[PDB]
């Protein structure tokens, strides 16, 4: 077949379909191809499944592989509430710091959903996003807060990560 990645990666890819990703990696797979939507299996992967991009990052899933709105697979990772698949871009190296198509990231995401124990992983492991400001500057840290989330705010703020640097 002549269709690298897009249409069969996005379906399969984005459709929760693991194996079918598989198969077709092991015979042909655009690693960084991306559709006229801006956005390459890797993007879409059912989050469901984290595994899904896995499949793609072995073989070269760029997890900053922004779209139209500069969100990065790491924003649809955490947006949603797929830390496991927030992980296979953080296992991949995925910019932790990724942002959207302005600077708020998927940290400010989750923190403006309140996916606490998501944004938690953010500053667990991987680069975190501390004073990590979007396009002003509301970081993930005034993002999980202008939206309420406080033990979103709170996570990042109590890990050095929500403004108040006073170390002295």
Same mark, same amino acid.
């Given at each position: 077949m002549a269709e690298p990645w897009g249409n069969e990666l996005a379906s399969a890819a984005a459709r929760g379909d693991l194996e079918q990703?598989?198969?077709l990696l092991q015979n042909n797979?655009?690693?960084?191809?991306?559709?006229?939507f801006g956005r390459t299996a890797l993007q879409?992967?059912?989050l469901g499944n984290?595994?899904?991009?896995?499949?793609?990052?072995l073989r070269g899933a760029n997890p900053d592989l922004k779209d139209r709105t500069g969100f990065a697979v790491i924003h649809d990772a955490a947006r949603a509430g797929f830390? %496991?698949?927030?992980?296979?871009?953080?296992?991949?190296?995925? %910019?932790?710091?990724?942002? %959207?198509?302005?600077?708020?990231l998927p940290l400010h995401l989750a923190a403006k959903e309140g996916h606490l124990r998501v944004v938690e992983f953010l500053v667990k492991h991987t680069a975190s996003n501390?004073?990590?400001?979007?396009?002003?500057?509301?970081?993930?840290? %005034?993002?999980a807060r202008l939206y309420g989330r406080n033990e979103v705010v709170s996570l990042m703020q109590?890990?050095?990560?929500?403004?108040?640097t006073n170390l002295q």
């Open positions: 990703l598989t198969s797979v655009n690693v960084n191809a991306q559709n006229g879409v992967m059912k984290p595994e899904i991009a896995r499949r793609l990052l830390l %496991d698949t927030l992980q296979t871009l953080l296992e991949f190296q995925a %910019d932790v710091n990724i942002e %959207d198509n302005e600077g708020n501390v004073g990590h400001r979007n396009h002003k500057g509301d970081t993930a840290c %005034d993002l109590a890990n050095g990560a929500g403004g108040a």
